[PDB]
């Protein structure tokens, strides 16, 4: 029996057998007043103590959110949908400490992704019990608000200021500062890590001053704030807020009266109208996301980055080979998870209209120009592979590289990886490759479980990734010093070296997607 006393009360953990060892899990610790009733849309209010022993023995409610209904029954897409009840009462976090209780352990804090509209910390692929067991780090994850309930913004108006989901996270980071010492964790050695919108959330904590003192280092997996889907403009955020007010009858004229009106609508009514607040939509459409609120973010983050105004520390940043493929079966004509999705120039051109709806005819032509100079015109998958690369280079790879370039320029160590291993278990078709989101199980040491059908080569690759991530977290340097591993160079805006992760040879390469990213980063922004 194990009971930790937090500043707000006592909490009872539970015991987990992992790899002939024992990990203690604390699942579902409240970290704020439930944002219910008059607290909907407002910032997370601090929590009143409890006298009891909170039985943090089961994952808490996931936050309200629309569910991806594109592949019922299919574990490839369903493994990402929430696996506890949805509920506005969802501000909870989890703690995996190694047993025997550590003394002064590095803390890893996981922020999930999901387009800022979806996600939950209780996913099987976010299970921190492995990392605690193998590397004796403490893993913490939290649920934060998503969609309108977590990112609605009427600027200046505390009734709905924006970035509430980000403030949810930041209140969790602070819970860890005030409480993790009781769990055997060193609040002075905290590494934020996250994926996709999680990764972009991590970058926004580097920029936000109120986060400066809540963490030590940062890890950005397939995502950063300068990604085109990541920050909403103050204009759009109001249009999207008001358009939502029409669709729900809640359109008033006193702004606060509008918010008053939405607080009395049902979570399902708000959930069901979010989709239409944009006039056109793409599969990469963050309807309600981060904005420049003058509280969490003081200015347009693209400026803060450019002018060095961020927490000075080490970052580890990477992306997956085929970031873009998953999105093609959510709309692109001629694509399917269930055939080889060979497509034509005309199908290719039509999918550009799908993925860049507001872009001029010449913008769409320029994308076709820079991705169809076929080295070999014979290949039939030319246009299929091109579109995946379009979406992946524009939405994920290039913004990650540009962020690492820019952030390293102010003198901090940065390490870049390129994950190129396709899971031996992966349930999606082969034309999709190394998909967005499918390094996460390797980062969390799930292949370390030999009773899971992963190959032995995958066991090692996970084992090495878990070592590298932990060393980065403890000592700001992501090396695997013992097993004669390939050393991981720092990323310098000059030479731009990165590490490839794979089951065969881990190599050191240079200037990833240089041709493609000069286009996306210098030309295309101007069209
Ligand atoms: C700001 O919002 C208006 C309104 O959008 C319409 O109403 C919403 C509730 C939602 O259902 C949208 O799809 C609606 O279109 C936008 O103006 C609309 O623009 C679209 C573009 O296709 C047009 O078809 C509609 O008829 C327009 N309706 C009105 C009332 O103007 C406007 O474009 C939005 N601004 C931005 C920057 O997105
Ligand atoms: C690949 O499949 C797509 C998707 O269509 C569905 O999936 C198939 C596996 C099969 O069950 C189809 O009958 C399904 O409808 C096909 O795209 C369709 O293509 C036809 C003709 O090309 C067109 O009328 C439809 O509008 C398309 N629908 C969608 C949703 O894209 C595509 O033709 C298949 N291509 C190859 C090369 O196999
Ligand atoms: C990385 N994790 C975050 C993976 C989780 N799902 C997605 O990221 C995703 C979601 C998508 C789309 C297009 N529309 N929606 C709708 C969402 C958002 C709003 C309400 C309905 C649900 C595309 C993708 C990309 C995607 C899908 C499956 C997958 F295996 C890996 C992936 F990369
Ligand atoms: C919280 O849990 C208390 C003790 O839990 C029970 O006993 C221990 C030894 C374990 O076996 C555990 O799995 C058992 O459930 C309960 O006595 C107490 O009522 C619980 N409080 C709640 C659920 O509010
Ligand atoms: C815990 O340790 C604190 C300082 O050490 C920290 O850990 C190492 C790994 C580095 O990241 C370093 O920067 C950190 O400062 C002490 O101040 C603290 O009192 C220690 N507490 C206990 C209970 O051991
Ligand atoms: C809007 O309504 C609120 C709630 O009564 C009120 O306090 C606020 O001052 C109003 N503002 C205007 C401009 O009418
Ligand atoms: C190093 O190699 C041994 C086998 O010689 C393996 O059991 C161990 O876990 C490895 N550690 C890593 C890759 O971090």
UniProtKB/Swiss-Prot annotation:
GO biological process terms on file: acetylcholine catabolic process; choline metabolic process; cocaine metabolic process; learning; negative regulation of cell population proliferation; negative regulation of synaptic transmission; neuroblast differentiation; peptide hormone processing
Principal cellular location given in the protein's record: secreted
Reported modifications of this chain: N-glycosylated. No other PTM detected. The major N-glycan structures are of the complex diantennary type with 1 and 2 N-acetylneuraminic acid molecules (Neu5Ac) making up approximately 33% and 47% of the total N-glycans, respectively. Only low amounts of fucosylated diantennary N-glycans are detected (approximately 2%). Triantennary N-glycans with or without fucose amount to approximately 13%, whereas 5% of the total N-glycans are of the oligomannosidic or hybrid type.
Pfam short name (any one): COesterase
General function of this protein: Esterase with broad substrate specificity. Contributes to the inactivation of the neurotransmitter acetylcholine. Can degrade neurotoxic organophosphate esters.
Subunit-level organization: Homotetramer; disulfide-linked. Dimer of dimers.
Record disease entry: Butyrylcholinesterase deficiency: An autosomal recessive metabolic condition characterized by increased sensitivity to certain anesthetic drugs, including the muscle relaxants succinylcholine or mivacurium. BCHED results in slower hydrolysis of these drugs and, consequently, a prolonged neuromuscular block, leading to apnea. The duration of the prolonged apnea varies significantly depending on the extent of the enzyme deficiency.
Protein name in the entry: Cholinesterase
């Amino acid at each position: 029996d194990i009971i930790i006393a937090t500043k707000n009360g006592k909490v009872r953990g539970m015991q987990l057998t992992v790899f002939g060892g024992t990990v203690t899990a604390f699942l579902g610790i409240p970290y704020a007043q439930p944002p219910l009733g008059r607290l909907r849309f407002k910032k997370p209010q601090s929590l009143t103590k409890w006298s009891d022993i909170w039985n943090a023995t089961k994952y808490a409610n996931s936050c309200c959110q629309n569910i991806d209904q594109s592949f019922p029954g299919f574990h490839g897409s369903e493994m990402w949908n929430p696996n506890t009840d949805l509920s506005e009462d969802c501000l909870y976090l989890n703690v995996w400490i190694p047993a025997p209780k550590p003394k002064n352990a590095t803390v890893l804090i996981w922020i999930y992704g999901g387009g800022f509209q979806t996600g939950t910390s209780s996913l099987h692929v976010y299970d921190g019990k492995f990392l605690a067991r193998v590397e004796r780090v403490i893993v913490v994850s939290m649920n934060y608000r998503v969609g309108a309930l977590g990112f609605l913004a009427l600027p200046g108006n505390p009734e709905a200021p924006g970035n509430m989901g980000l403030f949810d996270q930041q209140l969790a980071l602070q819970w860890v500062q005030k409480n993790i010492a009781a769990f055997g964790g060193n609040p002075k050695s905290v590494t934020l890590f996250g994926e996709s919108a999680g990764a972009a959330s991590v970058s926004l904590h580097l920029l936000s001053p109120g986060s400066h003192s809540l963490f030590t280092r940062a890890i950005l997996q397939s995502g950063s704030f300068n990604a085109p889907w990541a920050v909403t403009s103050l204009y759009e955020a109001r249009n999207r807020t008001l358009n939502l007010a029409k669709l729900t009858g809640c359109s008033r004229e006193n702004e606060t009266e509008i918010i008053k009106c939405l607080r009395n609508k049902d979570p399902q009514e708000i959930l069901l109208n979010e989709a239409f607040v944009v006039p056109y939509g793409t599969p990469l459409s963050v309807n309600f996301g981060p904005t420049v609120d003058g509280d969490f973010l003081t200015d347009m983050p693209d400026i803060l980055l450019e002018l060095g105004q961020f927490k000075k520390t080490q970052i580890l940043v990477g992306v997956n080979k085929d970031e873009g493929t998953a999105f093609l079966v959510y709309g692109a004509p001629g694509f399917s998870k269930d055939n080889n999705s060979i497509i034509t120039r005309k199908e290719f051109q039509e999918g550009l209209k799908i993925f860049f709806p507001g872009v001029s005819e010449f913008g769409k032509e320029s994308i076709l120009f820079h991705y169809t100079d076929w080295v070999d015109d014979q290949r039939p998958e030319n246009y299929r592979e091109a579109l995946g690369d379009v979406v992946g280079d524009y939405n994920f790879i290039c913004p990650a590289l540009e962020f690492t370039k820019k952030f390293s320029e102010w003198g901090n160590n940065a390490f870049f990886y390129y994950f190129e291993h396709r899971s031996s278990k992966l349930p999606w078709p082969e034309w999709m490759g190394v998909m967005h989101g499918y390094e996460i199980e390797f980062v969390f040491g799930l292949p370390l479980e030999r009773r899971d059908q992963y190959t032995k080569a995958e066991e090692i690759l996970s084992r090495s990734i878990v070592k590298r991530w932990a060393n980065f977290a403890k000592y700001g340097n992501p090396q695997e010093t013992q097993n004669q591993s390939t050393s991981w160079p720092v990323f310098k805006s000059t030479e731009q070296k990165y590490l490839t992760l794979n089951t065969e040879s881990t190599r050191i390469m240079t200037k990833l997607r240089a041709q493609q990213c000069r286009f996306w980063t210098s030309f295309f922004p101007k069209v």
